[model samples]
Target: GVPGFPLPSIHTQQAYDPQSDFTARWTRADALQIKAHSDATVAAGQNSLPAQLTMPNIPADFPVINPDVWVWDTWTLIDKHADQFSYNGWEVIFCLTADPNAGYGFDDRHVHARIGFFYRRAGIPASRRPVNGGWTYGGHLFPDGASAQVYAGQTYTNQAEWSGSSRLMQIHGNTVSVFYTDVAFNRDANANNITPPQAIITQTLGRIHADFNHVWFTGFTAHTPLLQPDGVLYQNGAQNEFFNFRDPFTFEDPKHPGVNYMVFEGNTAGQRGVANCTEADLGFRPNDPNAETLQEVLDSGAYYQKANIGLAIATDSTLSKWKFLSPLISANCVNDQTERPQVYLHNGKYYIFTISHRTTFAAGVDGPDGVYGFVGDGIRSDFQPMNYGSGLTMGNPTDLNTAAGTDFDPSPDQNPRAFQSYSHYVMPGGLVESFIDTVENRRGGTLAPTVRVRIAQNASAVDLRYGNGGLGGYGDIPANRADVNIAGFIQD
Candidate 1:
């Protein structure tokens, strides 16, 4: 039902080779694969790892130490956020988009489908902890105590598809807030099918501090304008431009004089006409409700034109202005095939992690450069790209590797010297600890990205650098930082 392009001709004659090279490439699949475990299980892999990883020489003033970050394989990863460290006592809770392998070309029966939520107890200590097996839900040790379950009930629709990205505070045991996707659900006598993707209708962001667990959600709506009162953000008095925002990534701002709650939302609309969208979120308070639609912009035709972007001030009285704030970041780009945007404030700046669109052979997936970020002064602006120059890690230096890959935490005296790393300044690791994940190196002969995690480290500031494992052969950024940053700075 394409308007001009029609159905059959919508797909172009594009072909790719996902098996030519021999390195890690970020793809949709990588973002979906994850693992969360307890400390006892992760420490077992200290031996027989990458030579460079065995001994991490970390910076002196490192953050707290939590061995749980090592639950996954260091070599393979799908996602990471340094700002995640600031959220005390948090756990990972997220879900992956699923596909039925019903697309064009190479059919590994690999549904454009996504696998998500790998929760192990690598960080939680075995001592003063629960027993009866593992860290699971309901019975004994919930393999990964999904945040949604802790807040809402287990009978929800997203109960099973309940695996995706999450906040560090919910998992680290610092705060008592639990967040999760509230995808609609239904039941029947015959059977049940966990519905496909749809705009979330009634989701909740719960805090142990809320007077009565004030859950905020939207009733089903058509476009962004309709999604307002439900916490939908806007830009330039417009809707649908950056619509389809879901997979809300939450965080409590530590830099703010007091702890402020913020979310990095992944939208589905962007510049280039189509392909993807940008990022937006609500800065509501824990004991407050989300924003509501108070005003609207309309044209003579009476058709919905757009929404005047504003901030939602969430105090007892300010709750009315909740949906009137500006977007944290917004842009139009060929590189914005990048979606699922998650902004993490590390050290003294913010790092945005997102996936890319390039398909690679070595990585056995699409978009090796799936994970990319812009370091900034606050979760607000002043971002510049990183320039490390050249690399030896990937055989194809010309490939795009900016996708969603997890991170790893190495010991202060045992981090890998080869891979460039960063810190949001307040993580659970001791001095220089690494957080890692595992990925399926499907591409044969080890020509894969090697199931390793992406690492970015800096005590306060982070600049997106371009280099292939220190080979020194760097290149210019394909897009404009000003184009993206400036637009975000003024986007309310």
Candidate 2:
């Protein structure tokens, strides 16, 4: 609590039952809803839906395609350093929001989510793929098999809402890795009634191999309070419950070239400050063999600072095994909900990027809520903000006409095109190109679209500016050039 701005006791807000089996309940409810929606859709008007649905008119050169819905959250395009004819070497993965009432004028309660995939030939132009027809909804991808399990299932007092988001993808050689939130078992009895969100990772091998009939699932991994290493869980009296784990981003390990380092949004093992205390200490208990108790943590002055970034590493060549290192950044000094935390390397320097809420803006300045970045000499080194205060890129675009207002800034006073999770790559021309999402229309209406931006680097800091030609448009990138060692260039 602040000196004058006191808050209600957290005891009143922490009302969770660790004994309750939310996993079982959510699974059962999802099964029923899946059946209901499937039946309802057929009954509405569909004449025939074959057991297997395939996108028609898919060109052989570039087969990848995007969904008809407006909500295309995050996407990644992987190019194989092989001959152009080797279509199976490339992949296009993107998140899709499948709501029955999506794209309507009003909000809907039944919002479901899934990740789509399209295997393309190496010769296929990236611009042609998103427009061509080549995507198959293979349900929810897991390590064992594809399941229809909704990402996150919520049970409010009057409404039961289903929500989920998958915004991370990594491609290395023949494997494609996907990271997303797994809310099925958010709470367990073994631990106290306090737990953060869990991240589920899946790796698929030969996803587009021509020798196989379909993509193959290889490995899956997850972590929770009970499953995490000693002293990582924040089981204090108050719960750090609300939105926690999400947006998994991976990059090649600078120290270990073949290995990968993954980072995701999470919470620290501390709480807010009061009066003289502004820093949340990450207290370490050496003597305690078991998990620290709520009273123990409080006495140690360790509380959870919301919206932190956690790091994990996959040392195995196949990325089958992942070990948690620690929470990378505290974020207590910034905001409570630091959504997407991504890491990239340029010119021997590492940059960490994240997007926080508009309310979490730093004092006086006003602009669109946006993507921010911090620069560090190395992954383990301390990172400093690249911009003066907020982020280098502002999500709220004042000049809607900058890109002809095609993708973002369609409405005035309300800048719905707040940039979200974005991906970036260094083009051969020596420019850093980033694909940022614009939250154009929400509430069962047109979903957000991605626009391209160029990252300008100065001696002081890096900034973002609208790229030429406005919105990147649908599938604007040209085909990957053959004999261009993609692995060496992008490093996944």
What's the lDDT for candidate 1?
0.24
Error of 2 at 252 (Å): 2.7
Predicted candidate 2 versus true structure: per-residue lDDT over 1-492, tens digit per residue: 112111211111121221221100001111111112222233221211111110011111321233344234343443221111222343334444344445532132212344443334445433454443244444334432232233325432111111122222333233444444433333344433234433343333233222223432333333221113223532122333343555556666655567666666665454334211131221112332322333543343322224466677775655546676656655432345555676655565665666554444222112234455555556654444443222343233322222122233343433333332233332222222233344433222121222333333311222223232333323333234322335433432
Off by over 4 Å in 1: 1-175, 184-197, 201-243, 268-324, 359-369, 388-492
- Candidate 2: how many backbone clashes? 11
Q: For residues 1-492, write the lDDT of model 1, one tens digit per residue.
A: 212111110111122221121111121111111100101122322222222222222222222112121111011111123232211121222223222233422222112222232222324433333321132211111123332343254343333222223222333222222222233233344334343222331222222111121211111121111123233433211333333333333334444332333333333232213222111111111222222111210111111211111112232221111222344433221122333344554444455443332221112112222234444444444233221110111111111212232223322322122122211111221111122111121111101111122335421111112122321110000100101122212321
The global C-alpha lDDT for each of the candidates, from Candidate 1 onward, is 0.24, 0.36
Q: Estimate each model's TM-score.
A: 0.37, 0.55
lDDT of 1 at 385: 24
